[PDB]
From a paper:
Mammals have four different genes that encode distinct p38 [name] isoforms (p38α, p38β, p38γ, p38δ) with high sequence similarity (e.g, p38α has approximately 75% sequence identity to p38β). The four p38MAPK isoforms are widely expressed and selectively initiate downstream responses dependent on the cell type and the activating stimulus. In neurodegenerative disease models, specific p38MAPK signaling cascades involving substrates such as MAPKAP-K2 (MK2) and tau have been implicated in controlling neuroinflammation, neuronal plasticity, and synaptic/dendritic pathology. The p38α[name] is of neuropharmacology interest as it is associated with intracellular signal transduction in both glia and neurons under stresses that are linked to progressive synaptic dysfunction.
The novel, brain penetrant inhibitors are soluble, acidic, and chemically stable small molecules targeted to the active site of p38α[name]. To confirm the active site targeting of MW108 and MW181 and test prevailing hypotheses, we determined the high-resolution co-crystal structures of human p38α[name] in complex with the two selective inhibitors. The diffraction data clearly reveals the inhibitor presence in the active site. The pyridine ring nitrogen of MW108 makes H-bond interactions with the protein backbone at the Met109-Gly110 peptide bond. The relative positions of Met 109 in the hinge region and the hydrophobic pocket’s small gatekeeper residue Thr 106 are indicated by arrows. High-resolution crystallographic analysis of human p38α[name] in complex with the new selective inhibitors confirmed the active site targeting and, interestingly, demonstrated the lack of a detectable glycine flip in the structures. The finding that the less selective p38 inhibitor SB239063 can induce the glycine flip, whereas MW108 and MW181 do not, indicates that the ability to induce such a localized conformational change is not a prerequisite for active site targeted probes with greater specificity. Large-scale kinome screens of MW108 revealed only p38α[name] as a potential target. The ability of MW108 to engage its target in a cellular assay was done by examining the concentration-dependent inhibition of phosphorylated MK-2, considered a highly selective p38α[name] substrate. In vitro and in vivo assays demonstrated the ability of MW108 and MW181 to ameliorate beta-amyloid induced synaptic and cognitive dysfunction.
Author numbering: 5 to 171, 184 to 352
The structure:
């Protein structure tokens, strides 16, 4: 076991191995807090996340396990992964805190688009990277579900990573989720990418809904109200009544709406912002789109190893989730 040292930062206690020095608070979330630090062992700047109340309930405990299982599995350039995971606990009985370590990332996509507007080359590179990461995640039968600019880490070099997804959101959400459809698919994430891309090209939020109903309205005004084929798939009586009760609207001409943008980007946007999710382009297909000809390489867009999500259907005791999480901490093998 390594030697740990203790300190308090922004009301939070950090108990970390001596190898991590110069801890500096980067921010706090509802699920944990993060410090930037220097990893003396590798010479790298890292971000250290201390999970908040990881075993407070069955929900937290299961979430903590999910987070650790997912992060231990993600090994891809465009997906946040683990350099280290540790706990100051010396045994399972005293196990109460979990710390996660990854490469320090300087900013998020929201910071970038917010000041100022991006060149077409940057939009190509940034979206390409999202999609490359998404291909990988999707290949593991995982759906991100909450992709948005604040969840995309980007460094000075324009390198991008999808964050732990894992642990207003509304604006980037697929319309079928606004309708509370219980059987949405992986293309909910493609919808989000389309919204992000649009924003990077125009400098404006595409669908700034004030609530779920307004969100749906803004979406239908751009893409049109659903046609017959899509209406047939809506099992909910009330949702169908509502939708069909709306003044019918035509799909707008994307070339006109995003005029000035690279026509290839407009073409791709149209393939991503398809109302019927069964007809939306997938991440793998999007990577092959001509818009990314300068970046696409089918021999360098890997898929993920199989990911066992069976635990998701289990109803276990807090101590069981805790012990499973503890095993995962102890079995972690750092990357080379
Ligand atoms: C912006 N946001 C919601 C973030 C931003 C970060 C972050 C900030 C700076 N560099 C890297 C990440 C982490 C975060 C921070 C540390 C992490 C450590 C291990 C695994 C995942 C981690 C995720 N989690 N969420
Ligand atoms: F005014 C109304 C009328 C009907 C609905 C409704 N019934 N089922 C689903 C919905 C609905 C409508 C808009 N956005 C999400 C869900 C919501 C508001
Ligand atoms: F108004 C809309 C907006 C989106 C959808 C939609 N797109 N893909 C799947 C659906 C959908 C929504 C509700 N129930 C089944 C399927 C359907 C109607
Ligand atoms: Zn909670």
């Amino acid at each position: 076991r390594p030697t740990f040292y203790r300190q308090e930062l922004n009301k939070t206690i950090w108990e970390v191995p001596e190898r991590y020095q110069n801890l500096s608070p980067v921010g706090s979330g509802a699920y944990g807090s993060v410090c930037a630090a220097f990893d003396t062992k590798t010479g790298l700047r890292v971000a250290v996340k201390k999970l908040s109340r990881p075993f407070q309930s069955i929900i937290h405990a299961k979430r903590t396990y999910r987070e650790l299982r997912l992060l231990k599995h993600m090994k891809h350039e465009n997906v946040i992964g683990l350099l280290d995971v540790f706990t100051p606990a010396r045994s399972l009985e005293e196990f109460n805190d979990v710390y996660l370590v990854t490469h320090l990332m300087g900013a998020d996509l929201n910071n970038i688009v917010k000041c100022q507007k991006l060149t077409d080359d940057h939009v190509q590179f940034l979206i390409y990277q999202i999609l490359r990461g998404l291909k990988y995640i999707h290949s593991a039968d995982i759906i991100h579900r909450d992709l948005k600019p604040s969840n995309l880490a980007v460094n000075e070099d324009c390198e991008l990573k999808i964050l732990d997804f894992g642990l207003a959101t509304r604006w980037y959400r697929a319309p079928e989720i606004m309708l509370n459809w219980m059987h949405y698919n992986q293309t909910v994430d493609i919808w989000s990418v389309g919204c992000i891309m649009a924003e990077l090209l125009t400098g404006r939020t595409l669908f700034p809904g004030t609530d779920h109903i307004d969100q749906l309205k803004l979406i239908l005004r751009l893409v049109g109200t659903p046609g017959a084929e899509l209406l047939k798939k809506i099992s909910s009586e009330s949702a169908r009544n509502y939708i069909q009760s709306l003044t019918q609207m035509p799909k707008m001409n994307f070339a006109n709406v995003f005029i000035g943008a690279n026509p290839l980007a407009v073409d791709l946007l149209e393939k991503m912002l398809v109302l019927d999710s069964d007809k939306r382009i997938t991440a793998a297909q999007a990577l092959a789109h001509a818009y990314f000809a300068q970046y696409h390489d089918p021999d360098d867009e890997p898929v993920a190893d199989p990911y066992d999500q069976s635990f998701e259907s289990r109803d276990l005791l807090i101590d069981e989730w805790k012990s499973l999480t503890y095993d995962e901490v102890i079995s972690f093998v750092p990357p080379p």
